[PDB]
Ligand binder design. Structure first.
Ligand SMILES: Cc1cc2c(s1)c(-c1ccc(C(=O)O)cc1)nn2C(=O)c1c(Cl)cccc1Cl
Length: 241
């Protein structure tokens, strides 16, 4: 009954209601690998069809990270300008981090559209360098054997960062940040997992992986606009034009 144990519980609950797939399912399907015939059917698809499918997954992924944020104790109580600043800087960073649950270190494959496949699945997109950076990142984290609670509390801190430029109420954002930071270290202490703090990616590795990812996604949307199931107008306004 400390406000801090309540926060851990309300963070982990929000994550559980928004994580799309259960970790038991992802681990049960690791033997369910795309065959050579199935990979080739993906390789043979138009760049722009692969772009449609991925644009769909990544949009859905963003919207689940938004709902995650809207269920974090204190988020809803911030002002709209600050909510949007945090989601604009952070929502896809969280998406990149969430992906590691779907990543199998042993064969270097990712759960995509029902089965596990290697980076060669996405050859028709032509962003071999970005896709290779996304696998490497996911590898780094998957080695750490990130647990559901560690992802939940870490991603919350990815979002609630009071150093994001353009916040109006810096002190209100600092109070949540401090509380979530305490939630995280408290948990890592109770689980003898403080050892991961030294192994996390630097803030810089994730910022730049994400800004290129968004850059590429923005170039695709310019060349080949997708139709988005827009749920959150203030944020969608900042990313589409
Ligand atoms: C920090 C953020 C990056 C980013 C966000 S937020 C959203 C998004 C999505 C939906 C809504 C909504 O209202 O439903 C709002 C925002 N898309 N997106 C992308 O990079 C993106 C994607 Cl995933 C697909 C295609 C093109 C692009 Cl540019």
């Amino acid at each position: 009954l400390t406000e801090i144990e309540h926060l851990v519980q309300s963070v982990c609950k929000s994550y559980r209601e928004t994580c799309q797939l259960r970790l038991e399912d992802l681990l049960r399907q690791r033997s369910n690998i795309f065959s050579r015939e199935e990979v080739t059917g993906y390789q043979r698809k138009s760049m722009w069809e692969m772009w449609e499918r991925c644009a769909h997954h990544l949009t859905e992924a963003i919207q689940y990270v938004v709902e995650f944020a809207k269920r974090l104790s204190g988020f809803m109580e911030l002002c709209q300008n600050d909510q949007i600043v945090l989601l604009k800087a952070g929502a896809m960073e969280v998406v990149l981090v969430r992906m590691c649950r779907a990543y199998n270190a042993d064969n270097r494959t990712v759960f995509f559209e029902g089965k596990y496949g290697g980076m060669e699945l996405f050859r028709a997109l032509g962003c071999s360098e970005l896709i290779s950076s996304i696998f490497d990142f996911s590898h780094s984290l998957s080695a750490l054997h990130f647990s559901e609670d560690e992802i939940a509390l870490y991603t919350a801190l990815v979002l609630i960062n009071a150093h994001r430029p353009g916040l109006q109420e810096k002190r209100k954002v600092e109070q949540l940040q401090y509380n979530l930071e305490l939630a995280f270290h408290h948990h890592l202490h109770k689980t003898h997992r403080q050892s991961i703090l030294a192994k996390l990616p630097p803030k810089g590795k994730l910022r730049s992986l994400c800004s290129q990812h968004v850059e590429r996604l923005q170039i695709f949307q310019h060349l080949h606009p997708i139709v988005v199931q827009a749920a959150f107008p203030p944020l969608y306004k900042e990313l589409f034009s």
